[PDB]
Amino acid sequence: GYTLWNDQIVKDEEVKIDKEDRGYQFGDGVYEVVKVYNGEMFTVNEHIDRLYASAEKIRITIPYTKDKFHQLLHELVEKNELNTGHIYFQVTRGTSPRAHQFPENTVKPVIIGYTKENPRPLENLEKGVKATFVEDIRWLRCDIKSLNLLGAVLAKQEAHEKGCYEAILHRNNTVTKGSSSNVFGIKDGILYTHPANNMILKGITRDVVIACANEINMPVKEIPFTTHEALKMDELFVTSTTSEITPVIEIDGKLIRDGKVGEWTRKLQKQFETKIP
Amino acid sequence: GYTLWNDQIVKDEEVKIDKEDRGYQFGDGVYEVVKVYNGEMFTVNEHIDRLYASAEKIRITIPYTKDKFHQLLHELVEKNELNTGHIYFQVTRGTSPRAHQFPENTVKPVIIGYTKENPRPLENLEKGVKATFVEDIRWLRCDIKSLNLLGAVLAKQEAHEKGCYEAILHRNNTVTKGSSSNVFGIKDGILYTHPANNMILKGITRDVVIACANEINMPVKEIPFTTHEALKMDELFVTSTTSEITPVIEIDGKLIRDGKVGEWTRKLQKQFETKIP
Ligand SMILES: *Cc1c(COP(=O)(O)O)cnc(C)c1O
Ligand SMILES: *Cc1c(COP(=O)(O)O)cnc(C)c1O
């Protein structure tokens, strides 16, 4: 296949990472994941804006204009002939001899991007998924979508070992986020979800679902709910670019309500579907 | 130069990292940094035991024995003819297509290790340094020396822009550790330092200093102290393999006592010298 390397589309083999790439040794980089539906990139601009925003938060300067970056992303989809799946891309501060502090502005940021054929998780969208409560041990800057993810892999892995799809993180017993997604809860026709602060990444799918909720005249309250209040909800689902709107029907062997995908979830999934290419 | 790559000492050029190297995308891996004093490695067994310990905490199985590793490290010191500097080595889970949960027991961990000429910070060890208080926003598993270091880089950089050497981290106004070192406080001939828990990395230099205190009949209290109490210490300093015992004589424009290196610090630095090759 083809991989985007800085400003070049090259063959995977030709691509190589240096042992002193700040993202390799420190996790000094940012990233994004864009979904493609039949050759069409879903909400690409939203994703491109956040890359630049996340890079700016750690004072990384991307050498290209959002336009040059958009074009490069499109060329990559064609060269790979990606139909339905996703585009992954990141930016690290660049390569320099090991040191914690920032290097000299001289260092060029390394950019890597590639594709993968991956269909929508239809079975999960229909029948729902299992989940587990895992304690939040991640760092305090989750608003930045960076490569500092060791906290997430340990959470996700615990979920997997129990046969769960996602792990729901909570700090001070208050639900925050999923290892790799945003958590929503529904009680009496009202949508609840933890507000946007340093505790959670302000997801793009998360924002679309709030627009969808506003469109179908459903009220939304960005109020934090506890893990006990979570098990008392009528419906519960998680969101992420790849997961879309995945229903959560059971947490730790405790069926949410009756253990069936709710009607409001369905309406949101039905409304969301209209925005997809 | 020569780079240790898995089980082969090869030239920097023959070594190549893959973009789906879990340590590159998730910071999924651990590391160590040993000091070499005139061809002789300092406390090398202690460091290798913490590498294997740190790997075990995230379920990484190093394919070689502690001997094969020791042997390899020694070859690397000779091939590079390293006199006085340090060795940096690390282990990642390996290369596998992008996914948060662990891959299969098939994937081999990628091992990297290389040297660097770096003298002793004589100036700092004699005249002391300036520091700055920075809030601890790191993940909750610092007991593991992992590659999830974005919190550390962001802290060091802040100290750096303020012309300070190190950043003294505090969580809930209680001093925990530096961006990349352990903190010690002295008040009335008694040695104070934060106890070993998930909040701090149990450093090797830290333990040496604690042994050096017992040997010189100095009382050690592993009681955490606040920032308000830190500013009231007779003496203050930080430790690490590369900073050894660096004395901090000022925190944010505020001198620690008279702004001179304390006598107890001098006695510890003197005793520490006896353990060096
Ligand atoms: C990437 C990510 C998400 C999802 O954001 P989307 O834009 O919906 O893909 C949610 N939470 C965390 C912690 C993430 O890293
Ligand atoms: C590596 C490290 C240290 C120092 O440990 P040493 O064995 O003395 O080098 C101290 N604090 C943190 C946070 C570290 O990561």
Curated annotation (Swiss-Prot), chains A, B:
PROSITE patterns per record: AA_TRANSFER_CLASS_4
Residues given in the record as substrate binding sites: Y31, R98, H100
Binding residues for pyridoxal 5'-phosphate: R50, K177
Keyword ATP-binding set for record: no
A cellular-component GO term for this protein: cytosol
Temperature-related behavior of activity: Optimum temperature is 60 degrees Celsius.
GO molecular function, one term: pyridoxal phosphate binding
EC number, as in UniProt: 2.6.1.21
Reaction it catalyzes: D-alanine + 2-oxoglutarate = D-glutamate + pyruvate
Enzyme class: transferase
InterPro entries: Aminotrans_IV (IPR001544), Aminotrans_IV_CS (IPR018300), Aminotransferase-like (IPR036038), BCAT-like_C (IPR043132), BCAT-like_N (IPR043131), Class-IV_PLP-Dep_Aminotrnsfr (IPR050571), D_amino_transT (IPR005784)
Gene Ontology process terms (BP): D-amino acid biosynthetic process; D-amino acid catabolic process
Superkingdom to which the source organism belongs: Bacteria
Gene3D superfamilies assigned: 3.30.470.10, D-amino Acid Aminotransferase, subunit A, domain 2
N6-(pyridoxal phosphate)lysine modified-residue sites: K145
Pfam families documented for this protein: Aminotran_4
Classification via PANTHER family: AMINO-ACID AMINOTRANSFERASE (PTHR42743), D-ALANINE AMINOTRANSFERASE (PTHR42743:SF10)
Subunit structure: Homodimer.
Family named by the database record: Belongs to the class-IV pyridoxal-phosphate-dependent aminotransferase family.
Role, per record: Acts on the D-isomers of alanine, leucine, aspartate, glutamate, aminobutyrate, norvaline and asparagine. The enzyme transfers an amino group from a substrate D-amino acid to the pyridoxal phosphate cofactor to form pyridoxamine and an alpha-keto acid in the first half-reaction. The second-half reaction is the reverse of the first, transferring the amino group from the pyridoxamine to a second alpha-keto acid to form the product D-amino acid via a ping-pong mechanism. This is an important process in the formation of D-alanine and D-glutamate, which are essential bacterial cell wall components.
Name of the protein in its database record: D-alanine aminotransferase
Originating species: Bacillus sp. (strain YM-1)
